[PDB]
Amino acid sequence: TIKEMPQPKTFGELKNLPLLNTDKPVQALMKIADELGEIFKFEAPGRVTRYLSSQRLIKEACDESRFDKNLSQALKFVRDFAGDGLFTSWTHEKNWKKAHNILLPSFSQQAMKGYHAMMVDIAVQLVQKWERLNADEHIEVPEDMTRLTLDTIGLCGFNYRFNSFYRDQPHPFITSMVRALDEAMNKLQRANPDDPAYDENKRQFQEDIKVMNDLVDKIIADRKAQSDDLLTHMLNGKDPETGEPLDDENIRYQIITFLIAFHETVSGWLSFALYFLVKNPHVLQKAAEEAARVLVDPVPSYKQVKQLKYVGMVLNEAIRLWPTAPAFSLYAKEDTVLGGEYPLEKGDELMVLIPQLHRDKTIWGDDVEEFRPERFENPSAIPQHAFKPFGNGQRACIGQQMSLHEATLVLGMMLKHFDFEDHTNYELDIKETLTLKPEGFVVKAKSKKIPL
Amino acid sequence: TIKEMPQPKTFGELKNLPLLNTDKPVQALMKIADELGEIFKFEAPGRVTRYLSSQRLIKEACDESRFDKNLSQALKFVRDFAGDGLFTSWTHEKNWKKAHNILLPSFSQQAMKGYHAMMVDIAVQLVQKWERLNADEHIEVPEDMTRLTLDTIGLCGFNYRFNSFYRDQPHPFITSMVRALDEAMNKLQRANPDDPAYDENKRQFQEDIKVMNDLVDKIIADRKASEQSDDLLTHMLNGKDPETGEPLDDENIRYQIITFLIAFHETVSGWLSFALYFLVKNPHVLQKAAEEAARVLVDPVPSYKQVKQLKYVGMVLNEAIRLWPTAPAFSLYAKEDTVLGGEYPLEKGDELMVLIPQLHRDKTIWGDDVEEFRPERFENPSAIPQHAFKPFGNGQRACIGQQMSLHEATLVLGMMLKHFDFEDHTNYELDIKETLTLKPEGFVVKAKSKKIPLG
Amino acid sequence: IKEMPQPKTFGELKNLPLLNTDKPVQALMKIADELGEIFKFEAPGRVTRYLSSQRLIKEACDESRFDKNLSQALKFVRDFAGDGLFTSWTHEKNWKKAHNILLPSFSQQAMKGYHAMMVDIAVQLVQKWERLNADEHIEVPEDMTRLTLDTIGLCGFNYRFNSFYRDQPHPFITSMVRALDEAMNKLQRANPDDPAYDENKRQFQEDIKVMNDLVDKIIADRKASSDDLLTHMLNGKDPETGEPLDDENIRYQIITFLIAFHETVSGWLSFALYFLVKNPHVLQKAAEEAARVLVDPVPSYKQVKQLKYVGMVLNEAIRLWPTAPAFSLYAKEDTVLGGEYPLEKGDELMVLIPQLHRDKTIWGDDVEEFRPERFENPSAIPQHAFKPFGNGQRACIGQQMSLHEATLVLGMMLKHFDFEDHTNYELDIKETLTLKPEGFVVKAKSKKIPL
Amino acid sequence: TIKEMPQPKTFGELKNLPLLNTDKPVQALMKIADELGEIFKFEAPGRVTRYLSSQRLIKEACDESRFDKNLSQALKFVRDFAGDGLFTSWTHEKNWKKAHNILLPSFSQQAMKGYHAMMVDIAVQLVQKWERLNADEHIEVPEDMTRLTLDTIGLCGFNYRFNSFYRDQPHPFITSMVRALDEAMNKLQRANPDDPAYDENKRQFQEDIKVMNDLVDKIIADRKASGQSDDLLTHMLNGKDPETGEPLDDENIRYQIITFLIAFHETVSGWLSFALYFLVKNPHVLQKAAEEAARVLVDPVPSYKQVKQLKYVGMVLNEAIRLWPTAPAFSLYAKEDTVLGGEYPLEKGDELMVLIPQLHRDKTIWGDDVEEFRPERFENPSAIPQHAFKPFGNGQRACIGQQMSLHEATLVLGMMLKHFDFEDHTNYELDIKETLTLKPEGFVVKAKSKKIPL
Ligand code: FDE
Ligand code: FDE
Ligand code: FDE
Ligand code: FDE
């Protein structure tokens, strides 16, 4: 011990729990970090956690020999419909390392080449929908990104077609997922989960899990009707220590896991980029420039997607400022001291506020709020563990290459084919589920009249 | 001659445990037993045991003068909620032989005739439900068998009505109970029962045992109040052991009540469920039993006598329990130092595991056509070799409810054949749910009512 | 400081039945995958530990702690390869002796003289493929065996095997290949005295006679009417003890060199060519490099050192399937390996090179993909992560020579032909003690470039 | 199964107190443990505790995320003269962490090398004393062990010479300390702290704290009269807490000395006395032990390295403290509400008592030969289950002095076998003296010198 850790305003037996009684919890934790600094204690009725925001402390917390991935209270609630899936499993749980080693092949750079084609299929549907709009209309950006990202993960991953672009009120599954995800966040604020007022909520949630298990558990049977896809790797892959493939119910947990994490992270990710592009018109220019120069075929090639360097940089700079999955949690593998100042008991919890990490002024310089993609011209100059939008270590985001490819591909095609107007002067408003997307974001797009 | 025993792949300090890190250990120990042969050593961190697969070795192990019933690690974990009840007590502990002797009267034939009435009650309810289904509806068999057996044991044993058929969601008591058995199973494989993944499991486990104890304490209240009662339960209360004179302490009563509920409802559901599977997949066998049904059940409701007629139905049930004994294994320890089968020396106290499924697949005893389902193997039961067919355990520690069960399945299985035709409308691939017991999972059928009325 | 994993045990026969296959090395890889970076492998009367991670492999290559061990495998090769360079103890008298007598033959200096005869053999192969009719095809490992054997026989010993003038394999190659087949098979044998194996032993005894009768033929053809590997054996004297090699040891070095070269380099070329037809972008990328640099009818020593992508292809092939897949080490004194595994002095280690070359922590998550671009900055490669040629003073003396031969040959093949995997060949790895693809066939269309 | 806790007979408003109105409670609680099994509740007027006997439950009770060290009612009374010394302080008491991180350097293996020389000196005095005995004279083992352990802790700890071997009548200092412990233990057992029967006690107790504080301030003053030793005492005067203050205040130091002196001389002597008991009672072991001493103690005086090489001797000592842990118990409280062993709910703050002697007798862990003295159990010390053997406590509050004590027991016991043959000439029946620590009462032997010189 040397240093007593700061802690924000406390409400008697309710601790600092009321501090996140916003619809914007993450943003509130930022507002607290901005005033209390690199670390602060955050107490709830049944739990206590420490939030880290400086690259200095995060570098220590990302030591895989001292800390492991913890299930935050948030992820504990997602465990009720995502169960034992990669995102919500403990490292030492039996299905993590099992599922982790079988699936890494399906997201290696080699796997992308196969996903590329179906990736494009959904990508044209989006382009066609925008081309077919009449002039007086506009684009509802998050909604169309959700349509795309879900149809892409559903098609490329499992060869199931959601056909979101053929419907206006969202898919029952997606509406159920979002309402299930919303319930997980809504619980965080209940200091009385037994209270009867939450019976309709507990009812609806239970009905929503049935909706997901319905479609998904049908899909596992609907394929036993084999191609080379994510589901086939799950049905056919073998674990070398017991020799068994994945549990039938565990697969149901992974599919649910992959559908949500992809559709929620990637759609938010694309939306944020587009905001920054229409708000930074010169960056928009140079980005459409490379887009026009590289996207030389009626359809993109896998090689060409890699040859977008500035579109990728806008993507990196977007996820820096608003990382769509804003936080991960860790626990102390053993007793240890953090930053030489804060001692930790075995089992103590840490929360990394990725947005606040990504604003650490000593690391990125004093223009941390400016959208300047050229910070990524020399990616090796960026310090180890200063930029962790995909988590850390073995528990790092398994789909970051799939995601980058999709975002790069789609963003490239958008820049080739349209010019974008911030016709309403949209002020950035962040919707918070557990993930982050912008809300009501709308643009108008004038077609560059180019065929596919 | 004194030959060393095979042992499968071993890891670090955690020994052979990762080999059995599945949701279907018995099916895995089988696929291991098939690989290593009749006997192999299986070490887990801090415990050592031998798994047996040949009748040759089992005949030696069923000598009650050399081996006594041992509590497997599995049973040590169910003892966490079944305590020293009949299933999970040491045969030398005081409460075993006390309870064994006070309760044994309640399961001989003479007692069965008394239960027959309420057994039919619960069965008519099942048939009544299957009659009352709409045309394109289906039957979830394991789930409806679960409703049946729990309703049957609780009424015959305890004059308590679960009224499971009056529910869609399983009785909450069953939900907790199944998760408790599932937890005992999972605790077997835990590579580190410490680290935090397992803290909610601790929560759930205790929460579920409390659930079971409450309705048990409600059954005991329901009787302190409600009667001319020839029960498992009256023999438990008023019954006195004729050797030391006293009756059961309350705690042991509670463990016996839970014990009886669980074992009946789990093994007997699995049995009937499997029986239907093999019948629907071998239709001439279904035909053969389906006429024994029509031929013997000539009154609107079966009589006790009619159940013993159904010889083939018993034969069907036997061949099913042979293939998948729902209690797939029992454990033994060496009373003293010995050599097993002349090849393997063992120190006193070494534990043995009988993989009843693997015994029941022995080719030297059953022939080369084992895995085929032919109920005709059980027609001269005296022709069946001694110690080759042990689905009901062994010796004085054998299943006390064997005849009650055989009577139960045959009656229920008989009526099902009398009143319905069964369609495997899904071409169901067999999926064995493994708690500690076995039973088919997701098994569904369609049933055509033969439109015969009931009483 | 922890206990080591171990595969399935069969009582008194220990782990021995696990390698009662025809492909033990590939079988040790499957075991490694289930048990990880280290596992104990016991047979009755023998114990060894298999290592798979660069983390532990870096330790086992510390030459102050561990020395080259003769695995049970090499001990059987010693029955016809004796005290030759490969099957010698580091302390044996003839090792250090022969090492210094022979090292002059593998310096860069020596290579430049060999290049002329190396080209000779390569032209024979090209002439043979060009002279094929349209419907015909190439049996790849067989033609690589014709090449490599003729090549070392020419450079090392100025002896012409004239393999390309034959349809039936060379008798030497047959006896020699089953001598390795027997050495490998003797390893898994539970009952070595049984009448089942009596015919194998007459046959083994006969294979050694065939090999020695040819070696005796080579020496007389020289002692007839040349600054080569053989003269250095006959005339060279050890600067440390003063004497040349005994006649006995000469026989073993000749046998050793013919076998080691022809077997490892046959496998290498075949695997390289295998990967080339399976990754056609690499085929194209490498195909052009030949045309750009190999501009004269026959390559110059300098030109081959310029074929860099080709060299990279070759390196990426020996990374995936190292033709000598293992070497063994023993602990010089009591020690602890990796802070986890205490070792008494004399305990044996086995380096499973194919599994080492798959350590993702070093090579990344795409280890199984054939990507020669990993070897652009070879200095970027961590030490002890890429060890196809062994380690330290006991490392392969014929290393740079092989790379030269493989590159010379691989380039000319790319210069002069286009190859079709007309069979969609599935990779089948034959195992003696070395590795080799077995049923590999392709078609080649001549580019009509003359020689 | 979430079980009702057994509890022995309760006597009116006096609860279970009449059950321990004996002179040997630990020995009695073992008897209770045997009838009621692995756990029972024990209530006294104002106290409730749960006594644990099984490895099953102890494995849970030593989880430091659930339980913290409690001041047992005993330790609450010892605190009356040990104050906030290391033994009788709460973990959250400021001075505990302060003293712990300041003093831990004095028990590192780095430190034993320094203590070894002075440890030997006291040990030689013991050898010389036994050698210079006349033929009829026998040896009273515990009394000599006390002389040894106290002279050694004072010399190593504080560079102060008690010179106990120059006395036959006990130190005024030690009799006061021994009587203070005996009183704290007995004041635990009294129904009425009001009765006039206890006035002489209340007089003597307050008088004995007076002597202890006297002698201790002499030690703290005698070093000022010197200014140069690198010992426990210099570490207390010079060590500063790396946490927020600098040095140890002069009052807590007054308590660390009392704590160390008492903790060493009572546990470490009783341990040695016990080690000798089993050796004279199991001659096969003694033969084996002398064997090892004769081979290893190859210098006229033993060296620090040689001591490490005395394995079997370490085995017997470990086997002795297993059978009779001289500090027989420690106490724990619940940091929050929890369930113990899945059966017994505990409210936050509820107290537990670990009966180290009964745990070291758990058949499931050690086998059915619990009572027989077989030092061969400890040749694979890493094979022994975790938390089945806790003679030096548990966790952050485990005995700081294990390293040193074992160094003493090995050193002293080793020479005894080097230089003497031992006869239980009286056929001594084991009688266990119980203060808060344990110790044989009246153990006597005769020793024949092997005539080996130094
Ligand atoms: C499919 C997919 C897609 C995606 C995307 C994404 C984006 C854009 C972003 C992101 C992120 C992330 N992730 Fe992500 N993702 C995914 C996924 C995933 C999974 C499965 C996971 C888990 C793995 C492990 O760790 O185990 C993740 C994971 C992840 C993470 C971590 C978590 C924790 O808690 O630690 C993060 C931070 N992810 N992400
Ligand atoms: C009620 C009931 C019913 C039944 C059924 C049955 C079926 C179906 C099958 C069976 C089985 C069996 N069991 Fe059975 N069961 C019963 C029961 C029982 C009991 C109580 C027991 C224990 C007994 C004694 O002896 O104690 C049994 C028991 C039994 C056994 C053995 C166990 C041991 O561990 O040894 C077996 C194997 N079971 N099981
Ligand atoms: C001639 C020749 C050729 C060759 C080639 C080759 C290839 C391709 C690959 C290889 C390899 C090798 N090698 Fe080799 N090679 C040779 C050789 C040799 C010799 C002689 C040896 C031994 C040396 C010494 O040191 O002694 C070798 C050696 C060698 C090795 C080592 C082994 C042990 O045991 O350790 C290895 C790993 N190799 N290799
Ligand atoms: C000097 C010294 C010496 C010694 C020794 C001994 C022997 C022989 C035995 C013993 C023991 C013991 N400890 Fe002992 N010791 C000592 C000490 C001590 C101290 C200071 C303590 C407290 C610590 C803390 O941190 O808290 C102890 C501590 C101790 C313990 C714990 C108890 C409680 O409270 O928990 C035990 C059981 N110890 N011990």
Side-chain angles (χ1 to χ4, degrees), chain D residues 26-40 42-47 49-58 60-93 95-103 105-107 109 111-168 170-181 183-188 190-191 193-203 205 208-209 211-213 215-216 221 223-225 227 229 231-239 241-242 245 247-249 252-286 289-290 292-304 306-307 310-313:
Chain D
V26 175
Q27 270 155 307
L29 291 161
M30 296 177 60
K31 265 298 104 203
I32 295 171
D34 305 329
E35 331 161 30
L36 299 189
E38 60 175 329
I39 178 172
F40 62 94
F42 178 74
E43 205 160 12
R47 305 152 51 198
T49 323
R50 299 134 195 103
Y51 282 94
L52 305 179
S53 330
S54 69
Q55 149 63 20
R56 175 261 272 255
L57 302 175
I58 295 303
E60 277 204 26
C62 289
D63 188 84
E64 281 184 286
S65 75
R66 311 189 53 203
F67 306 104
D68 184 11
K69 181 216 179 109
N70 184 32
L71 288 195
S72 52
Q73 192 57 63
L75 285 188
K76 289 189 192 86
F77 285 142
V78 200
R79 195 173 195 253
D80 297 332
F81 50 93
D84 69 341
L86 275 182
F87 209 105
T88 50
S89 40
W90 298 95
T91 307
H92 58 79
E93 279 224 328
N95 275 322
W96 179 73
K97 185 187 288 318
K98 192 178 167 176
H100 182 359
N101 287 335
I102 286 179
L103 297 179
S106 299
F107 302 82
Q109 302 290 4
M112 297 299 110
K113 321 256 183 83
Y115 296 145
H116 178 79
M118 295 167 174
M119 290 183 39
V120 161
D121 180 333
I122 301 307
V124 192
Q125 287 193 70
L126 173 82
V127 169
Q128 294 178 165
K129 175 176 173 166
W130 287 0
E131 291 206 334
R132 288 170 204 170
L133 294 179
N134 307 123
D136 50 294
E137 322 208 80
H138 60 49
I139 293 169
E140 333 188 296
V141 165
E143 297 68 22
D144 271 339
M145 298 301 94
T146 288
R147 286 188 246 274
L148 163 82
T149 62
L150 179 86
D151 265 38
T152 183
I153 177 62
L155 186 61
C156 294
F158 316 111
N159 201 94
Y160 180 83
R161 294 202 161 254
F162 285 105
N163 296 310
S164 60
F165 291 117
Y166 296 85
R167 302 157 152 279
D168 39 352
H171 263 292
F173 185 59
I174 305 316
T175 37
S176 293
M177 292 179 348
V178 155
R179 258 162 64 191
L181 261 204
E183 171 69 1
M185 183 256 249
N186 278 331
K187 62 185 291 198
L188 210 166
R190 63 200 32 160
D194 54 81
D195 193 288
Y198 307 123
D199 289 324
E200 199 21 73
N201 305 89
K202 287 179 188 179
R203 188 220 65 62
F205 193 65
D208 286 333
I209 90 105
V211 48
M212 296 184 55
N213 293 330
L215 181 273
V216 84
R223 174 180 291 277
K224 274 273 213 82
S229 320
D231 68 357
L232 286 179
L233 183 50
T234 45
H235 286 78
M236 277 174 294
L237 294 167
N238 263 74
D241 75 283
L248 222 333
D249 91 335
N252 182 259
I253 301 173
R254 197 206 198 98
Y255 287 123
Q256 303 300 336
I257 303 272
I258 291 171
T259 297
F260 278 152
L261 293 177
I262 296 183
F264 191 94
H265 97 252
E266 271 272 333
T267 60
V268 186
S269 69
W271 192 7
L272 281 167
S273 301
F274 275 121
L276 251 175
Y277 171 101
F278 291 115
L279 286 181
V280 212
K281 290 300 202 180
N282 305 274
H284 299 99
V285 181
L286 196 44
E292 199 205 47
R295 170 189 344 120
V296 187
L297 296 178
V298 78
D299 336 321
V301 49
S303 79
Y304 179 80
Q306 300 320 300
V307 184
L310 293 172
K311 194 258 201 288
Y312 192 74
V313 169

Side-chain angles (χ1 to χ4, degrees), chain B residues 205-206 208-209 211-225 228-229 231-239 241-242 245-279 281-285 287-304 306-310 312-342 344-346 349 352-371 373-422:
Chain B
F205 189 54
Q206 313 188 349
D208 290 336
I209 284 166
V211 169
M212 295 181 229
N213 281 114
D214 288 354
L215 71 142
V216 142
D217 284 333
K218 103 182 312 172
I219 286 181
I220 304 158
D222 239 283
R223 178 176 292 276
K224 291 202 86 289
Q228 177 58 110
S229 354
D231 254 333
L232 192 47
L233 179 49
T234 47
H235 285 76
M236 281 174 55
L237 293 3
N238 324 323
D241 186 87
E246 56 282 84
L248 300 178
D249 42 312
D250 301 304
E251 326 83 275
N252 187 248
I253 292 173
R254 279 162 83 229
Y255 289 125
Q256 299 299 341
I257 304 272
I258 293 169
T259 300
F260 282 114
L261 290 172
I262 294 356
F264 187 95
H265 150 255
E266 281 283 335
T267 61
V268 182
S269 280
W271 195 4
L272 282 167
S273 302
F274 275 119
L276 255 54
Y277 168 66
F278 287 116
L279 284 183
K281 295 304 199 183
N282 302 270
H284 287 97
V285 178
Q287 139 196 288
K288 228 190 168 284
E291 50 76 7
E292 200 194 46
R295 173 185 77 252
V296 185
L297 297 178
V298 315
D299 45 19
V301 295
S303 81
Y304 179 38
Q306 296 175 321
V307 184
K308 284 165 238 49
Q309 317 255 53
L310 296 172
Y312 195 72
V313 175
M315 295 176 213
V316 192
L317 290 163
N318 276 275
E319 177 67 354
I321 217 66
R322 184 189 66 91
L323 284 163
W324 295 114
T326 47
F330 54 85
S331 187
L332 307 163
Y333 71 102
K335 283 171 81 78
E336 275 100 31
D337 290 32
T338 322
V339 172
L340 183 66
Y344 311 99
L346 62 106
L352 297 173
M353 272 285 268
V354 181
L355 283 163
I356 311 184
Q358 210 64 277
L359 167 78
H360 292 180
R361 281 159 176 69
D362 189 10
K363 282 195 184 177
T364 46
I365 286 288
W366 300 92
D368 65 335
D369 65 331
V370 285
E371 302 248 34
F373 180 83
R374 63 179 228 103
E376 289 77 37
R377 315 166 174 277
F378 290 93
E379 51 188 67
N380 327 331
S382 34
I384 298 166
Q386 165 156 176
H387 300 163
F389 178 70
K390 306 235 71 186
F392 294 124
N394 166 96
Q396 63 180 309
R397 298 309 302 269
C399 176
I400 190 169
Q402 161 166 18
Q403 63 316 305
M404 193 187 186
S405 307
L406 193 43
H407 190 258
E408 163 70 340
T410 313
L411 168 135
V412 161
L413 192 45
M415 285 173 70
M416 297 179 37
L417 298 176
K418 167 178 171 167
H419 284 273
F420 306 83
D421 294 324
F422 298 88

Side-chain angles (χ1 to χ4, degrees), chain A residues 70 76 79-80 90 92-95 98 240 242 244 247-248 331 347, chain B residues 11 17-24 28 190-191 195-198 431:
Chain A
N70 183 34
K76 288 190 198 260
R79 185 174 181 83
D80 295 333
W90 299 94
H92 307 262
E93 271 200 280
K94 303 306 188 39
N95 278 326
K98 189 182 165 180
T242 87
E244 289 197 332
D247 219 355
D248 254 328
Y331 73 101
Chain B
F11 295 73
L17 181 122
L19 283 180
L20 270 282
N21 212 263
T22 172
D23 52 313
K24 297 174 168 38
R190 295 278 201 255
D195 114 37
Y198 311 130
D431 181 24

Side-chain angles (χ1 to χ4, degrees), chain C residues 104-107 109-111 113-125:
Chain C
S105 300
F106 296 77
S107 81
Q109 295 304 290
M111 310 300 322
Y114 298 153
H115 179 87
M117 296 169 176
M118 288 186 179
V119 157
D120 179 336
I121 306 308
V123 194
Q124 284 199 71
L125 176 82

Side-chain angles (χ1 to χ4, degrees), chain A residues 69 75 86-87 96 258 265 269 328 390-391 395 397-398 403:
Chain A
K69 181 196 180 147
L75 284 191
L86 272 70
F87 215 113
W96 181 76
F258 290 110
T265 59
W269 190 4
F328 55 105
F390 296 104
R395 299 314 302 268
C397 183
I398 190 171
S403 306

